[PDB]
């Protein structure tokens, strides 16, 4: 302002950015086998 | 024929050559188990003023 004349200018600006990525997992595998022989029929148990 | 792992008695014949009382049994097993699990999560947030 100079002296009548008056001037005023105000500017405001804000920005915000956010990113969140999360991944959690588990996989399990297990195999077991057997084999046997027996050299009366009652013993088959 | 004598009683071997069976009934009281058994009768063979001339054409039959042999009878056996040897009990032999075998076995085999193949068991499997598994599990496959997946988990994907994603998130985003943006604010402007
Ligand atoms: C995951 O694996 C385990 C391993 O024994 C199993 O007991 C369970 O049933 C599985 N779950 C699934 C495939 O959803």
- Output the six-digit token pair for B30: 């193949």
State the burial class of residue B1 (Cβ atoms within 10 Å of its Cβ: 0-12, 13-18, 19+).
middle
- Output the six-digit token pair for A32: 């077991």
Mark yes or no for CB contact B31/A38 under 8 Å.
Answer: no
The overall longest dimension of chain A from CA atoms, in Å, is 125
Rounded CA separation A34/B29 (Å): 5
Resolution of the determined structure in angstroms stands at 5.6
Could you tell me if the CB of B34 is within 6 A of ligand 1?
no
Among candidate residues B49, B5, B44, the one with its CA nearest the CA of residue A40: B5
- Written as one string, the DSSP assignment of B27-42 is EEEE----------EE
**Residue of B29, B33, B44 with shortest CB distance to A34:** B29
A 9-38 residues with CB below 8 A of B? Answer: 14-38
Rounded CA separation B12/B10 (Å): 7
Rounded CA separation B48/B34 (Å): 48
Experiment type: cryo-EM
Rounded CA separation A40/B10 (Å): 16
What's the gap in Å between B32 CA and the centre of ligand 1? 12
What's the gap in Å between A24 CA and the centre of ligand 1? 17
Q: Is A11 left (phi over 0), alpha (psi -120 to 50) or beta?
A: beta
Enumerate the β-bridge partners of residue A15: B48
Specify whether the CB–CB gap between B28 and A37 falls below 8 A. no
- Written as one string, the DSSP assignment of A1-45 is -B--B---------EEEEEEEE----------EEEEEE--GGGG-
What is the DSSP-derived secondary structure letter of residue B7?
S
């Amino acid at each position: 302002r100079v002296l009548f004349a008056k001037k005023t200018k105000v500017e405001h600006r804000c920005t915000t950015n956010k990113l969140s990525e999360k991944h959690e997992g588990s996989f399990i595998q297990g195999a077991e086998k057997s084999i046997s022989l027996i050299r009366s029929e009652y013993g088959a148990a | 024929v004598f009683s071997g792992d069976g009934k009281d008695f058994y009768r063979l014949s001339g054409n039959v050559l042999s009878y056996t009382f040897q009990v032999k049994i075998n076995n085999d097993f193949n068991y499997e188990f598994y599990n496959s699990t997946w988990s994907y999560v994603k998130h985003t947030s943006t604010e402007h003023t």
